[PDB]
Amino acid sequence: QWSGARALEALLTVAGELRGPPLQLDTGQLLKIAKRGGVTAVEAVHAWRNALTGAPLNLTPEQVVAIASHDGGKQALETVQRLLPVLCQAHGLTPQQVVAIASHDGGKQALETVQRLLPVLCQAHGLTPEQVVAIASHDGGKQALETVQALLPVLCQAHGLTPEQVVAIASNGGGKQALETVQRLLPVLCQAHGLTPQQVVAIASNGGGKQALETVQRLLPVLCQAHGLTPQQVVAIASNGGGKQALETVQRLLPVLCQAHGLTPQQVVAIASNEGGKQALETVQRLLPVLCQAHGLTPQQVVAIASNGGGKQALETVQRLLPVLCQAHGLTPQQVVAIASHDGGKQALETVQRLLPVLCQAHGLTPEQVVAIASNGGGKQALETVQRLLPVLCQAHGLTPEQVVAIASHDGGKQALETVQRLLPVLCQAHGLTPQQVVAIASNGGGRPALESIVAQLSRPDPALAALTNDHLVALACLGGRPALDAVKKL
DNA sequence: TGTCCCTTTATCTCTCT
DNA sequence: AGAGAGATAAAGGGACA
Ligand SMILES: [Mg+2]
Ligand SMILES: [Mg+2]
C-alpha cells in the first residue's frame, strides 16, 4: 500500500491517549507536533508524558508541545529531562529559559552547547547568561555559540564592534553565517561604501543576515548610482530579513512602480523596508490598479497598507474583506484601511470580521471601540483578549469597559490586559495605588513591563528609588514605562 | 526518514523621544 | 503617537547519515 499508512496509524494510535491526562492535547496541538516534530516526536511526548509534567521537571503541557514541535523534537525532549536541573542549578538558569533554548530545530545541540560554553563565554568573554541564552535560542544555536566563542575577539578588536553588537548579530537563525560575513565584509562596506559599523550591524542583525550583507555589497552601487537611491535607503531596505529579496526586487520594481504607477522612490523604499518586503512590492504592482478603481481606495491608502510587514497579506485581505466588512458590518473603507495598516493586518481584519458582532452584542462595545482595539499591531491578540477578559476585569476588579478598552488599545494590548489581571490586586490592595493609576500605567505601549517594574520596585524595594513616592513612580511609569524606571534605578 | 542548519515571510511586543 | 527596534513563529529547502 501507500508507505506512510503504517506511520499515520502509529501516529493516530498514540495521539488518542495524549488527548486526556496528563497532557490533555487538543487535535490542534497534535497536528502541530506531527507536522514539525514528526511521528517520532509524538511517540516521545507520549513515552514520557509523566516524566516532564510530573516531578522534578513540572513542565506545563504547552511547554511540552513547544519543545516537541521541531525537527529533532524527541532529541530535545530527552535532552531537556537530563539537562534542565543541571542548567537551572549549576548555571542559575530558570526552567523557562531552558525551555526557550530547547524550543527550536536542533534543541539538543543548543542545550548541550549552552551546558558546555556558558561558563567560558561569561568568564573569558564577559557576556551575561541572558546574552548566552538569547544566542542559543534560535535554530543553529550551537553554531552561533561556537562562532561567538571563536570570533568575539577579532570582531571587537580588529573590527571595532562592541560585544553587544556581536550578540545582536549572533542572536538570529543563521547567526554563524551573519558573524563570518560581517568579519569579511565590514571593512569592504565601510571603506568602499561609506557605511558605519552600526549600519552594517543593523543589516547583519536579522535572519539571513549573510544574504542581506552580500546583497548590499553587490547591489548598493547600482541602486545608488543608477536609481539615485541614498545609502540610507539601501540600508533601511536591507535591515529586515528577506533583505536580499527586497533589495533584488527594488532594483527591478523601483522604476516600474515610479513610471507605470506614479509612486515616489520614497514610497517604494517604505514598502520595501519590511519583513517580506519583496512580497509587499510585488503585491502592490499587481493590486494598485485594482484597489484604486471604481473611485475606490487611494494610492496613498494602498501604500500605507503595504508599508508594514506582511503587507502582501494585508493587501489581499483588504481586497477580499473590504466589501463584506463595509456592507455587512457597517464599516467605512477608512476604518478598514486603518485595521489593515499594521503588522498582522490580515489577522486583525479576519478577527474583526469574526468578533465584531460578539464584542458588540455580548459585551456592549461600539464598532468604533472594536476598530480602535483592532487598529494596533497585534490587533487580533488584543481583540481575543478583550473578549475573554473584559467581563472579568469589570466584575472582579471594578474596571469600566472604557478602561479595559484603553488598556487594550495599544501594541501589546493583550500583554497589558493579562498583566492588569495579574498585578492589579497587589498594586491596589497591598501598595495603595488607585485602579485609575494602574489603568494609566497600563494604557501605553510597554504596559506589561511598566507594571512589572513598578511591582518589582514596591515588592522588593530598591533604595535607589527611596526618594520617589508612589505618586512619582506612577508618573514615571506612565511617562516612560520600564525604561524610565530602570534609568531612575541607575541613580 | 530523523536531525541539524539556514533563509524568508508573517506576526506580535516594546522602545525612544 | 509614530518610527524604529526588538521578539517569536511557521514553513520550506539543503545536507547528511
Ligand atoms: Mg524589523
Ligand atoms: Mg524539512
Residue numbers in the entry: 231 to 721
Describing publication, verbatim:
Each TAL effector (TALE) repeat comprises 33–35 amino acids and recognizes one specific DNA base through a highly variable residue at a fixed position in the repeat. We then present fifteen crystal structures of engineered dHax3 variants in complex with target DNA molecules, which elucidate the structural basis for the recognition of bases adenine (A) and guanine (G) by reported or uncharacterized TALE codes.
To test this speculation, we generated dHax3 variants with the 34th residue on repeat 7 substituted with different amino acids.
